[PDB]
From a paper:
Talin plays a key role in coupling integrin receptors to the actomyosin contractile machinery, while deleted in liver cancer 1 ([name]) is a Rho GAP that binds talin and regulates Rho, and therefore actomyosin contractility. Talin comprises an N-terminal FERM domain (∼50 kDa) that binds to and activates integrins, connected to a large flexible rod (∼200 kDa) that interacts with multiple ligands, including vinculin and F-actin (Calderwood et al., 2013). The talin rod constitutes a force-sensing module that regulates the assembly and maturation of adhesion complexes, and is composed of 13 four- and five-helical bundles connected by short linkers, forming an extended flexible chain (Goult et al., 2013b). The [name] binding site in talin has been mapped by deletion analysis to the four-helix R8 domain (Li et al., 2011) that forms a unique protrusion in the C-terminal part of the rod that is otherwise composed of a linear chain of five-helix bundles (Gingras et al., 2010).
For these reasons, we used the longer [name] fragment for solution binding studies and the shorter fragment for crystallization experiments. We crystallized a complex of [name](467–489) with the talin [name] fragment, the structure of which we previously determined in the free form (Gingras et al., 2010), and solved the structure of the complex by molecular replacement (statistics in Table 1). As in the free form, the [name] talin rod fragment adopts a unique fold where the R8 four-helix bundle is inserted into the loop connecting helices α3 and α4 of the R7 five-helix bundle. Individually, the structures of R7 and R8 in the [name] complex are nearly identical to that of the free form (root-mean-square deviation [RMSD] 0.35 Å and 1.75 Å, respectively), the main difference being the relative orientation of the two domains. As expected from sequence analysis and NMR data, the [name] peptide forms an α helix that interacts only with the talin R8 domain. The [name] helix docks into the hydrophobic groove formed by helices α2 and α3 of talin R8, forming a canonical left-handed anti-parallel triple-helix coiled-coil arrangement. At the N-terminal end of the [name] helix, corresponding to the LD motif, residues L469, I472, L473, and V476 are embedded between the hydrophobic side chains of L1492 of the R8 α2 helix, and V1540, K1541, and I1543 of the α3 helix in a “knobs-into-holes” arrangement typical for the coiled-coil packing, creating a small hydrophobic core. The negatively charged [name] residue D470 that is conserved within LD motifs (the “D” residue) makes direct contact with the positively charged side chain of K1544 in R8. The polar side chains of Q480 and N484 in [name] (positions “e” and “b” of the heptad repeat) make contacts with the matching polar groups of N1534 and N1538 at the edge of the R8 α2-α3 hydrophobic patch, creating a polar ridge. This ridge is extended by charge contacts between E488 of [name], which is wedged between the positively charged groups R1523 and K1530 of R8.
Numbering used by the authors:
A (entry chain A): 1354 to 1659
B (entry chain B): 467 to 489
The structure:
């Protein structure tokens, strides 16, 4: 019936937990730009949200409310993932602060949209440069340039926001302004060329493509600069020992939450199963205990990170 | 679309993008 959507929500959550668990395998790079204290608050907030989801997961499987069960599962998955990222980020910060450790860095990931927009804009500009292009051809090139430069600027905005490195964060936005400014100028020359196709307006419209192509090339080159590539930190043995409380607790919470969701998936189908209700309460107990142990350890290392 | 609308769009995008923080 309406169980199918609940079953699939459980499958998605379990897959997502498996993905965030790799963050705990061997932290050697920062996840994001959060401070140690931001990580602390994030773990706090996400655990509140998780605690209410675990009650919603349990009550709605028992009472047969399949849409409310599915939404509890989706909520728990998002909170568990948020939690794990803040714990992996905190773990990294603990490990590299040991004086025998060496820093790592997140590589910037290049949007696949970049390549698409790049090729599209180049072909559209090459078209605008053909000495015999028509008013229909000029309209289609303008349509393609506008669509892909708008998408390029938004990819830059998002890439800027998820880059911790401040030089890369700044360049993504400067590139976005270069693209937007040169696109605005180009379409203005297209507007003039439209209906006045002299060699002089062709030359000007042709000249206006050069700044846009330079902006696009500069952006795609910077995205490949070696100084922004991922480098794994060298965590000292004393660094590793210090991140153990956070890492172990995060893993245990993930293991138990996975077992909780796997059990709730079956209880949503047939909730007349006392053995599985007691398994589920065991897992939920360990989820809570592990969160308590992780938060406690983070609060206590906290003076060293002020 | 039409050329007039494309011009409005990229000009409005330029106004928005030029205010973006680099920090």
């Amino acid at each position: 019936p309406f169980t199918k959507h609940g079953q699939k929500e459980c499958d998605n959550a379990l897959r997502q937990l498996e993905t965030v668990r790799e963050l705990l395998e061997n932290p050697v790079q920062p996840i994001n730009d959060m401070s140690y204290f931001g990580c602390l608050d994030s773990v706090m907030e996400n655990s509140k949200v998780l605690g209410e989801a675990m009650t919603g997961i349990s009550q709605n499987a028992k009472n047969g409310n399949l849409p409310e069960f599915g939404d509890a599962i989706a909520t728990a998955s998002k909170a568990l993932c948020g939690f794990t990222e803040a714990a992996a980020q905190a773990a990294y910060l603990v490990g590299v602060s040991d004086p025998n450790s060496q820093a790592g860095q997140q590589g910037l990931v290049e949007p696949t949209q970049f390549a698409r927009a790049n090729q599209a804009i180049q072909m559209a500009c090459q078209s605008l440069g053909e000495p015999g292009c028509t008013q229909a051809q000029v309209l289609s090139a303008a349509t393609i340039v506008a669509k892909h430069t708008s998408a390029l600027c938004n990819s830059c905005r998002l890439a800027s926001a998820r880059t911790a490195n401040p030089t890369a964060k700044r360049q993504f936005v400067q590139s976005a302004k270069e693209v937007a400014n040169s696109t605005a100028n180009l379409v203005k020359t297209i507007k003039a060329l439209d209906g006045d196709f002299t060699e002089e307006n062709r030359a000007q419209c042709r000249a206006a493509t050069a700044p846009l192509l330079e902006a696009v090339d500069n952006l795609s080159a910077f995205a490949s600069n070696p100084e922004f590539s991922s480098v794994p930190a060298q965590i000292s043995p004393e660094g590793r020992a210090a991140m153990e409380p956070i890492v172990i607790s995060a893993k245990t919470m993930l293991e138990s939450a996975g077992g909780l969701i796997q059990t709730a998936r079956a209880l949503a189908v047939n909730p007349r199963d006392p053995p599985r209700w007691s398994v589920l309460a065991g897992h939920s107990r360990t989820v809570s205990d592990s969160i308590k142990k992780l938060i406690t350890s983070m609060r206590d290392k906290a003076p060293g990170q002020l | 679309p039409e050329l007039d609308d494309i011009l409005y769009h990229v000009k409005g995008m330029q106004r928005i993008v030029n205010q973006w923080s680099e920090k």
